Design a binder for these strands. Structure first.
Ligand SMILES: Nc1ncnc2c1ncn2[C@@H]1O[C@H](CSCC[C@H](N)C(=O)O)[C@@H](O)[C@H]1O
Lengths: 76, 97, 105, 324, 95, 86, 94, 108, 81, 97
DNA sequence: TCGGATGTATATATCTGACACGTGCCTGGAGACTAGGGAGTAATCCCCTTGGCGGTTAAAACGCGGGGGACAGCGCGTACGTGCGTTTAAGCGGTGCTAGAGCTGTCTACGACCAATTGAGCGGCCTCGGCACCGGGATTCTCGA
DNA sequence: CGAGAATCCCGGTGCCGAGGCCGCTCAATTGGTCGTAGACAGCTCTAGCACCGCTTAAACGCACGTACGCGCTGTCCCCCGCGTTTTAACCGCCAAGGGGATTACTCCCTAGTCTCCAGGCACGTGTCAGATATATACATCCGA
């Protein structure tokens, strides 16, 4: 399984993801290969914020669901 | 047609203004000025007339000290008459702005 | 029992009131013993200096009543108090009568 | 009695005319209204040069009856032009610039009928009843192409004459507005109802708006701020509690939110670091809009409103620098 | 009905000690009142800064002496030093 | 008469001879013309400096009124101490 | 063994890193910044103390600090600093 | 029986709430010290320090340097408009002055 | 005891300070005038600093006493506490 | 025999002194001066070398600010060269003495 | 150099209303006793400061063309004084008047203060790397042409 | 514009402070209490606040006219630029030494509580120092 994110930089990010991987796991991966604090990283999955209590397969996120890097700013 | 030379009518009443010292500023247009320039910081600011007289005294002495040092600027420029570049010089040296 | 600790120090400025302002003023934890005494003494000496300079202008202008003009000429015509109070302004008095050199024809 | 040009109900006027002050009260106002009718389609200046002269005595009911009956004959002439094989009037057309300036001054006179108790208000709170001219708002409307989607919000509408200016100017769908102080909110209701009747009386379109009597702390306004892009308030006398709360409200918004301020929420030369991730200037572009600029306002200096425009590309290039 | 604690009678007594046959206007009285509060607050803040600068909690006469020798012009300062020295001496001898 | 209690033009109230009057207080033999406008600007900036402070004192004391004490403390923070009022 | 003297050095470190990730400071500049912040601290503390003196209080609150900030800083500097304090006291409140 | 949090993180900040509160007590400023007062004051110092080190790092990158020396602090102070007006009565060691050339001394 | 040290402020040193301040051309009496002004300024500061050091009942001048005297001068040099 | 005109050797090294900024004052004769002028206020005053360097920095910046305003005095006098009456003017306007 | 002619102090009748002097009272200021803790001193111990010797040397001091600013006057036109009609708004002094400022009675938030609890925060140890520095060489004014 | 005179910069070499990490306080932080401080109702009252008569000094303009500002011009002289010749500056080394931080250890000084008390501040008073109208000599200016 591999999904994507269409950033507002337009970086189609390669996401080393698995259905065992959580939402926070992918957020830390975006921190890894993006340098971004994961405090804000909403990803548009059919117009839903994804939550770290669930995983990718808990939302049943289909592969190549090209998400969108939304910034729910939590410097706050 | 008796008329004095200039400098006379300067120095007489320079003496009178240095001696007879009350406000030498019409306090009603001054007070309207103070009310206007305070109105922009905040609307509806009641004053004390004592406070506005204090402002008049403060601004009076402030501009007089500025005038004296500005006169020193013009004298040091070997100029009898004061031009506002003297004022800008004096405010620069005093370090207002 | 009238005591008047300023006069017990031989003075005129109040011990208890200055001690009140020191305790109110948060200047330290504690107020020392001779501190308001010495403070009131220095205040009394400075004020005596000021009024001694004011009475001279009172003599100068045939006035039995000290005015802001007297105070103004007293402060400005001093040397050291002028240096002390150069950043200090007195209302109602005016300035020194002062004419510059090259304005007189 | 001055009709809408489609033969509708006349704007009935009292004798004597409503005195508001001595300098440019409602006597000169009706005359200038028909001077804008001279600035309309010219079939009345032929009668307006005749006996509607500048020389006339004070309280000239003669000139009032002349002015009203010449205007009624002018509307009858335009109706004789219309009622052949000709369409009467396109409805949705808009008033022009100085016409709408007259319209806002007209609503101010005929609605604000007590500036005295408007002056008599409460101490320090964002209740500071300072207003803006027609002209900076007009240039700001020129600066921000408010679409049918880009609506307007005036939280703290005052009397909302600015919102009416935006409504009669742009092609917007709706507008918002709310108010906290009671006397100008009641007079704002007067402004609302009168101005809607006024744009009936001109037969021209004004866009929709919601002026309210309430607050901004509610989550309703959070949602509505997140909806509507273009926002302004004269925030200059509000206090940095309220203004920072409104920054926090603006955080949840969409990109390119063309938000104008009076006192700015960020410097016009703002730069990002890692500290200001909580702050609000990172996600927006902070530019100065043009003042009057001939402005003996409250301030003798010009007013100089300030546009904020949402842009998170700054922070995403900052993320690229965090990669670097 | 209220209290605005001026120092006017102190000025009265000192004026009758130094120039007994002259008076004062109340405007001049307020000028001298502001003068006395100015000198008091300057010396008091000077001594408070000294107390913080030398890690101690009790401002005493030596501290006020240092504050005077800092804050005033020097010859008049030594005069006021001697005045307060003899005055605190009179406080000790007549405790 | 009346409308909103708005003052718009009072810089001329520091009049041409009054500036000259204060210059003769300052002991000036002869004055150029631009001294008038320049001095009006300087006094306006100085009054901005003081009146912001006094208004801020009123806001913190939560009054509506400018006392003399506010002015004295304002000039105290200016480093130009005035007496005669507190 | 030395006595644990106060400094602001780790906080200047935190501020320095959080404004710029790989920017250093000379130790002379460290002592300069420490003296600077102590100066600004003493100025605002003294002005708030004079304000509480001028309105007869016993407890300086953030109201007085806000007012002395508005008194001492010039312009937009104050306009942002008060908002920084607003955010921070708001975060500390809950 | 909860664990100790920290007031700077409770303020969500970086500057020491406890140290500023201790200095406000030991500074002899009022008899008592408010709760939000040292929080607000630490925020004010945070903004001032951030603002001056922004321009310090700006000058340092202008000289392409990493360890900020007093020169860049000096230039950061006297090059900014509002900061110099804040710090006109302020002298910083080891910085020297601005590049300040009076243009009338320049030749033709 | 010492001597001649006000002339220890040298003609190049005053020249170097002048060339820092933006002085194009110096006159001859500038040197002695600047020495006198420096001497007055230094007496005003150093007398205060000695007052601090003696008030601490210490014999050794710290940097902090100079800092406090410059705080009295409205100058407040940093780098030292 | 290459020699520059005057004003060149002014402005070059005006640039170098405004950029390269360390002390520009020989601190050993300066330090002996400070020890002498402090010796008269009190004999046997030990220093800190840090304190004397602080004095050097303070006096450096003080005289440089005096020089800058004095240069403004001479420019306002329409004089390229500075005479000590400019210094006396600047100290009078600043109000030192 | 002094006539004419000024607004310049000096002098004196007539208010007057600000200013020195009781007053009374009450309300902040002066002693008796605690105590405990800042602070003064005894001791000491390290450590920074002073002082000196010596080696280098940058840097300061005379000096000498020279060249550029200082400076003395002129004259010319300009703007800045001046009495004087005019004109114009300003001050003094009546009216109510009301909005805002000062005093009071809770009282409840709300921060001093002590005591567990510990973890952020500072003294000190490698370290290494931005920077000090040096040396070479490309690059840029320059000032007599 | 071209030889010279620095000057910018590039790169190599090393180095000594920053700076990350290590141990170990003690000061922050939690969690309590406990008095009390300003905070808000709630109230009197006074003091700016318009307003206008109503006089009135004074500002505003204006023809004159004149002292000054300044562009300019010799001039001169004195600082400047670079050179040569001293000279402490300065850097490091040795060595004492006294002085500033420390612990220790009482001690006595002031905070605080209580209680008397008297003197400072409204308050009210007379009252007389000076303000002002009117006349009267005079330092200075216009000018012959
Ligand atoms: N949180 C809030 N909710 C609603 N109105 C508010 C508000 N905060 C302030 N206001 C109101 O906003 C008004 C601003 S006065 C502005 C006048 C008018 N809008 C104009 O400029 O033309 C004030 O009267 C105040 O009562």
């Amino acid at each position: 399984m591999q999904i994507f994110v269409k950033t507002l930089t337009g970086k189609t990010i390669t996401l080393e993801v698995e259905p065992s991987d959580t939402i926070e796991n992918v957020k830390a991966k975006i921190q890894d290969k993006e340098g971004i604090p994961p405090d804000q990283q909403r990803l548009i999955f059919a117009g839903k914020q994804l939550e770290d209590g669930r995983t990718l397969s808990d939302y049943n996120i289909q592969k190549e669901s090209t998400l969108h890097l939304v910034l729910r700013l939590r410097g706050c | 047609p008796h008329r004095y030379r200039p400098g006379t009518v300067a120095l007489r009443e320079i003496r009178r203004y240095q001696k007879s010292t009350e406000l030498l500023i019409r306090k009603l247009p001054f007070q309207r000025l103070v009310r206007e320039i305070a109105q922009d910081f905040k609307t509806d600011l009641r004053f004390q007339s004592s406070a506005v007289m204090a402002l008049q005294e403060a601004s009076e002495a402030y501009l007089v000290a500025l005038f004296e040092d500005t006169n020193l600027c013009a004298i040091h420029a070997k100029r009898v008459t004061i031009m506002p570049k003297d004022i800008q010089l004096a405010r620069r040296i005093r370090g207002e702005r | 029992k009238a005591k008047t600790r300023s006069s017990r120090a031989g003075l005129q400025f109040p011990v208890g009131r200055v001690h009140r302002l020191l305790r109110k003023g948060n200047y330290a934890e504690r107020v020392g013993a001779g501190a308001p005494v010495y403070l009131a003494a220095v205040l009394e000496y400075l004020t005596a200096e000021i009024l001694e300079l004011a009475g001279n202008a009172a003599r100068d202008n045939k006035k039995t009543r000290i005015i802001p003009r007297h105070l103004q000429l007293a402060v400005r015509n001093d040397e050291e108090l002028n240096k002390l109070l150069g950043r200090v302004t007195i209302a109602q008095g005016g300035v020194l009568p002062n004419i510059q050199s090259v304005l007189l024809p | 009695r001055l009709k809408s040009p489609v033969g509708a109900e006349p704007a009935v006027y009292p004798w004597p005319l409503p005195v508001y002050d001595k300098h440019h009260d409602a006597a000169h106002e009706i005359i200038e209204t028909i001077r804008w009718v001279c600035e309309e389609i010219p079939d009345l200046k032929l009668a307006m040069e005749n006996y509607v002269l500048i020389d006339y005595d004070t309280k000239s009911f003669e000139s009032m009856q002349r002015l009203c009956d010449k205007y009624n004959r002018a509307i009858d002439s335009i109706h004789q032009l219309w009622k052949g094989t000709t369409q009467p009037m396109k409805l949705n057309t808009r008033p022009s610039t100085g016409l709408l300036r007259h319209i806002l001054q007209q609503v101010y006179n005929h609605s604000v009928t007590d500036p005295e108790k408007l002056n008599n208000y409460e101490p320090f709170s964002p209740e500071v009843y300072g207003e803006t001219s027609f002209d900076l708002v007009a240039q700001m409307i020129d600066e921000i192409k408010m679409t049918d989607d880009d609506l307007f919000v005036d939280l703290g509408s005052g009397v909302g004459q600015v919102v009416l200016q935006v409504a009669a100017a742009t092609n917007c769908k709706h507008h918002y507005g709310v108010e906290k102080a009671d006397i100008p909110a009641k007079y704002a209701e007067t402004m609302d109802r009168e101005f809607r009747k006024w744009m009936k009386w001109y037969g021209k379109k004004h866009a929709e708006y919601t002026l309210e009597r309430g607050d901004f702390l509610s989550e309703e306004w959070r949602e509505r701020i997140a909806n509507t892009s273009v926002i302004f308030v004269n925030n200059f006398a509000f206090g940095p509690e309220v203004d920072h709360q409104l920054k926090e409200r603006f955080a949840n918004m969409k990109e390119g939110g063309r938000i104008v301020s009076s006192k700015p929420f960020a410097p016009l030369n703002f730069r990002i670091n890692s500290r200001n991730l909580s702050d609000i200037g990172t996600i927006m572009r902070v530019v100065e809009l043009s003042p009057l600029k001939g402005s003996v306002s409250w301030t003798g200096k010009p007013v100089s409103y300030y546009l904020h425009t949402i842009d998170r590309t700054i922070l995403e290039n900052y993320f690229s620098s965090l990669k670097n | 009905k209220t209290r605005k604690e001026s120092y006017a009678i102190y000025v009265y007594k000192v004026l009758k000690q130094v120039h007994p046959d002259t008076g004062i206007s109340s405007k001049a009285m307020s000028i001298m009142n502001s003068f006395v509060n100015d000198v008091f607050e300057r010396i008091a803040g000077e001594a408070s800064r000294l107390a913080h600068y030398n890690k101690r909690s009790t401002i005493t006469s030596r501290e006020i002496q240092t504050a005077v020798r800092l804050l005033l012009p020097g010859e008049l300062a030594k005069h006021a030093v001697s005045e307060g020295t003899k005055a605190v001496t009179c406080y000790t001898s007549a405790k | 008469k009346r409308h909103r209690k708005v003052l718009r033009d009072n810089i001329q109230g520091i009049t041409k001879p009054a500036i000259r009057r204060l210059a003769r207080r300052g002991g000036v033999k002869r004055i150029s013309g631009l001294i008038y406008e320049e001095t009006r600007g300087v006094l306006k900036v100085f009054l901005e400096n003081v009146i912001r402070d006094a208004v801020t004192y009123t806001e913190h004391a939560k009054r509506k009124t400018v006392t003399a004490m506010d002015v004295v403390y304002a000039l105290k923070r200016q480093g130009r101490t005035l007496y005669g009022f507190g």
